[PDB]
Symmetry: C3
Subunit: 130 residues, 3 copies
């Protein structure tokens, strides 16, 4: 056991466990855990149904999917989700990963359960002196 | 090992990215042909290049700092994630586009050769199994 | 690698730290009270510069709470702080966060407020 995703206790659909679309893709595609509506101009935390574990010195970044803005009118409003290794299994929400999405359009957008919403990439990070 | 090549549709070697300084992380990708972006619109801006890399490597595209405050443009998906197998794909040869939104109320024109995003190559890690 | 105060600031409270023992990011703070008008973009001073090794980069990311709590976003999405920005002759490598106020009221950032998170990472070079 090194790094990866697990379903949080609140979800049991293994379809939500992220996979890479191609053999050399950097990103794991996280999915919408339950139907989620986003009103015009609103920001909504979209549940992903999963938590992520990793090694010390590793981080998981969540990036928007390319098609979100031009096809769905949605953007990851904080640009990049920074998921720390100690978020996993925290006592507050078990490390459940949410995507903070904003609807840029003037009509309500609905994300169906199972739709891919962000891509996650695991990477090393470095520490400052001392 | 890793780097950029012109796609077959473009021949101006000026488009091949370089780093602005010797210790910069990013390679500056340029606009391949004059591209207009209407007020409030999102446009895929051609860069004229494709990128190859090793297994376990990814290329990220980031906005240039000056884009929003100087040009009124932003990279609307925030970070472009260019996978190693995008290179030479049968659909568009792995041609890298920058998805730019014009935040202003006037048409913005990007001239050929203008720097538009910066690309950084980095390692990534795989999940168990 | 690490952070130093620029010569213009002396409050060591501005030196970034990680919030938890396994966090990826160092929390950079607002160096002086900074107002951002409705819909405006403002370069927010952080009071620090960053040194690192060759082959290393410092990325600045938005704080999760900025958009939904404060109505602010890092307008260039990710700040890319190069190793040779440090001690440049123009501004000493002073790191600014380019923040946009999405709301219809002026937002004020107080000195000492956390504004972005910095992560140090390796990068790779092209052939030749």
């Amino acid at each position: 056991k090194t790094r990866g995703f697990e379903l949080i206790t609140d979800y049991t659909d293994e379809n939500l466990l992220p996979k890479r679309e191609t053999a050399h893709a950097a990103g794991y595609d996280l999915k919408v855990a339950e139907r989620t509506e986003i009103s015009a101009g609103a920001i909504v935390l979209v549940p992903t149904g999963v938590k992520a574990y990793m090694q010390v010195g590793e981080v998981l970044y969540l990036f928007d999917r390319s098609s979100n803005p031009r096809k769905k009118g949605l953007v990851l409003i904080n640009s990049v989700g920074v998921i720390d290794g100690d978020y996993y299994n925290n006592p507050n929400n078990e490390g459940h990963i949410f995507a903070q999405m904003k609807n840029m359009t003037d009509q309500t957008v609905v994300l169906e359960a199972g739709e891919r919403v962000v891509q996650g990439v695991f990477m090393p990070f470095l520490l400052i002196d001392g």
